[PDB]
């Protein structure tokens, strides 16, 4: 699966560089809304079945690593650049840019990474129609397929 | 420590070896098993399954549970008698068996 | 090669450093134990690095020799205190070996 | 940790080996507190691979 | 109500379903969205393994 993960990441990077049209953006927005509602902002441990709990937590952890940690890293890099700039300017150590600039960088970089990897998170929640999470995921998938005039798993 | 270990080894393995040296008319197998039990059931190579999670991961733990059940299925085994039971769940997390004793076969853990 | 099912278990190269194969459960356990063996040496390695640094820096006659006035040793249980680490090594070895056995 | 727990630190130093390496032993903690992170994280990854 | 002989094999019963309508069994099974992909993967694995 390392090869599969590398291929998925490279495909997402290429798609992001390519850009998105109106229909693709609408589908991605729906996927991101579903993921945020059911995984990111919801405690996975509150689901009914153990299988769906485990798979939802796997999706949540993958989302954390691929979005939250990456955005924190990029925002920290931006805040460190700003910190170096201000340290050079004032010829002294400054602590204000770290928190504020880091938060701004995280807020800027979370949407882009979420858009880049929206499809992967949406697909990882396909537990099955036998569960509430899987049923909602299937409904959102049907909506996205209708929007995009294509069929996806 | 070495002397105590050697004394225990002697008591289990050396002195009992001389108890029986010829065919026995009465209860030969019983006496042979009596002398062999103390040597074949030493805790050094029996104890440890109670803390198997130290080396066995959950999935590995379940696979090794089924493997050990198959290996020690033989009723005539004092080592199996003295060994800790395999009919238990991984303390950290269990993925295969939800409840202990709820199987479809009295031998296979699944 | 049993048809399209590749049954070969060893794919080691000319300069292999690890085990020939890692499919066997015994070899997997041995590899994991060996990898985690070296994880528990941080404090000892740092202490030895500091000792070497200090000896190379200040313990030469040129810089800072020390007058060793002690006549005879007086240690009584330092051996017991120090042999806890080899005790842990032995405990880990016994645990892994018995689990495999 | 170590000698501080004893109310006779001279005896603590004498009874073990009659040698003094306390400076290095106590300066090694700072380095040891961070030298282990890469190995620990790679080991976490390897353990996850074994579990999979 | 049941006919009091539920489960009895009719005399001369033949285990044939030549003209049976399978549309009534649609609701008794659930197929995931990737059923076609699973079918193709199963066929590939069976061909390359057996």
């Amino acid at each position: 699966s390392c090869t599969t993960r590398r291929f998925i990441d490279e495909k997402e990077k290429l798609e992001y560089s390519r850009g998105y049209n109106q229909q693709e953006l609408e589908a991605s927005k729906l996927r991101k809304d579903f993921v945020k509602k059911y995984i990111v902002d919801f405690d996975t441990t509150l689901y009914k079945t153990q299988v769906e709990r485990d798979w939802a937590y796997i999706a949540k952890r993958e989302y954390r690593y691929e979005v939250q940690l990456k955005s924190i890293g990029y925002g920290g890099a931006l805040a460190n650049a700003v910190l170096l700039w201000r340290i050079y300017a004032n010829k002294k150590m400054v602590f204000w840019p770290i928190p504020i600039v880091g938060a701004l960088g995280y807020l800027y970089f979370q949407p882009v990474f979420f858009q880049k990897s929206n499809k992967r998170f949406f697909d990882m929640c396909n537990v099955g129609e036998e569960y509430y999470l899987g049923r909602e995921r299937n409904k959102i998938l049907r909506e996205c397929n209708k929007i995009l005039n294509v069929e996806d798993f | 420590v070495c002397g105590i270990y050697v004394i225990h080894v002697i008591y289990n393995y050396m002195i009992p070896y001389y108890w029986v040296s010829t065919p026995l008319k009465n209860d030969e197998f019983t006496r042979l098993r009596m002398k062999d039990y103390i040597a074949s059931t030493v805790l050094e190579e029996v104890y440890g399954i109670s803390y198997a999670e130290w080396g066995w991961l959950p999935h590995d733990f379940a696979y090794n549970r089924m493997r050990g059940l198959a290996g020690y299925m033989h009723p005539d085994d004092p080592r199996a008698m003295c060994t800790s039971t395999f009919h238990r769940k991984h303390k950290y997390i269990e993925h295969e068996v939800e409840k202990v004793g709820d199987y479809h076969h009295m031998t296979y853990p699944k | 090669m049993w048809g399209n099912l590749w049954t070969e278990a060893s794919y080691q190269l000319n300069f292999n450093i690890g085990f020939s194969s890692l499919r066997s459960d015994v070899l997997i356990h041995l590899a994991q134990w060996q990898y985690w063996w070296w994880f528990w040496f941080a404090l000892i390695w740092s202490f030895y690095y500091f000792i070497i640094l200090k000896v190379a820096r200040f313990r030469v006659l040129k810089m800072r020799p020390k007058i060793s006035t002690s006549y005879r040793p007086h240690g009584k249980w330092g051996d017991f205190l120090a042999c806890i680490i080899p005790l842990i090594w032995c405990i880990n070895i016994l645990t892994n070996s018995n689990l495999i056995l | 940790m170590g000698s501080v727990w004893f109310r006779n630190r001279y005896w603590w130093y004498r009874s073990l080996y009659d040698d003094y390496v306390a400076r290095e032993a106590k300066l090694a903690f700072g380095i040891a507190a961070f030298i282990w992170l890469p190995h620990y994280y790679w080991g976490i990854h390897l353990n996850r691979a074994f579990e999979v | 109500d049941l006919p009091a002989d539920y489960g009895k094999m009719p005399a001369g019963y033949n285990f044939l379903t030549r003209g049976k309508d399978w549309r009534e069994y649609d609701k008794d099974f659930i197929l995931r969205t990737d059923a076609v992909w699973e079918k193709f993967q199963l066929e590939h694995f069976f061909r390359n393994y057996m």
């Binding site: 299988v51 485990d54 798979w55 937590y57 796997i58 952890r61 537990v127 099955g128 | 130290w54 080396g55 991961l57 959950p58 999935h59 950290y92 997390i93 993925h95 295969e96 | 994991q32 134990w33 985690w36 994880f39 528990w40 842990i88 405990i91 880990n92 645990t95 | 620990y40 080991g43 976490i44 353990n47 996850r48 579990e51 999979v52 | 197929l31 995931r32 990737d34 059923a35 699973e38 079918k39 199963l42």
Partner: peptide, 20 residues
Amino acid sequence: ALFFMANTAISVPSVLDTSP
């Protein structure tokens, strides 16, 4: 031993059957 492995990936679940 106690925590010689230093970590256990309890998150990794048993792979779910997906056959039709």
